[PDB]
Design a binder for this molecule. Structure first.
Ligand SMILES: [Mn+2]
Length: 233
């Protein structure tokens, strides 16, 4: 008996299906590609990856063959793209063994961890929480969800981001420091994973600023493409 209608849950389109995947929590892995860790001035051999979150309602589903018109955000001069493999949780649990971890992943999609980099870097230098840099409005564009019933659990796949026809990021998901299986196991030590949860597994090297009017195209092998154009605030 709600006082007023809640926000409907953000629901991902599912490739080749009329059914949608309702989003619960949004987990993100930071510094999960050695080359990216190094370009940000960190040592991936002496410090491990780490976890942060975005609200479900920062997730913005983008249909295949469509372009998201994404408003440049408030309170930033330094707005970064980050292409990422997204794993969707179908089966929950705690302290999930590495050997069954990928069995908890219902599907995969192309995602962007859009970032107010100036704000994120200011919070990092002040030892403060990163939410103003990472957990902001429409900060997680994502493509259709591909079921592991279709695409299995890929350990190899090219991951790429182009801006205005220019390659900016090109790596392979097999470069993840914590693989999908490791990230699901380790996340499950700190939180009970549940169906609907998404994991943004981190971004390869080549992250950069994007300005209004510029167009981005991300792709992962087997997972199609993600088209986003940055427009006015
Ligand atoms: Mn990221």
């Amino acid at each position: 008996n709600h006082l007023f209608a809640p926000e409907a849950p953000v629901s991902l389109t599912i490739h080749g299906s009329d059914q949608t995947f309702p989003v619960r929590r949004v987990y993100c892995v930071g510094r999960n590609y050695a080359a990216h860790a190094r370009e940000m001035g960190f040592d991936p051999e002496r410090e491990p990856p780490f976890f942060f979150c975005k609200p479900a309602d920062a997730v913005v589903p983008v249909a295949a063959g469509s372009t998201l018109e994404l408003a440049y955000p408030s309170q930033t001069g330094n707005y970064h793209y980050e292409i990422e493999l997204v794993a969707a949780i179908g089966k929950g649990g705690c302290d999930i063994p590495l050997e069954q971890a990928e069995e908890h992943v219902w599907g995969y999609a192309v995602g962007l961890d859009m970032t107010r980099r100036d704000l994120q870097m200011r919070m990092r230098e002040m030892g403060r929480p990163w939410e103003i840099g990472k957990a902001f409005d429409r900060s997680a564009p994502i493509g259709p969800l591909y079921p592991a019933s279709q695409v299995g659990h890929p350990r190899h796949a090219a991951i790429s981001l182009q801006v205005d026809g220019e390659d900016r990021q090109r790596s392979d998901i097999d470069q993840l420091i914590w693989s999908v299986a490791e990230t699901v196991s380790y996340l499950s030590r700190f939180f009970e994973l549940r169906p609907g949860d998404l994991v943004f597994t981190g971004t390869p090297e080549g992250v950069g600023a994007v300005e209004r009017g510029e167009r981005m195209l991300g792709a992962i092998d087997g997972l199609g493409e993600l088209s986003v154009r940055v427009v006015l605030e």
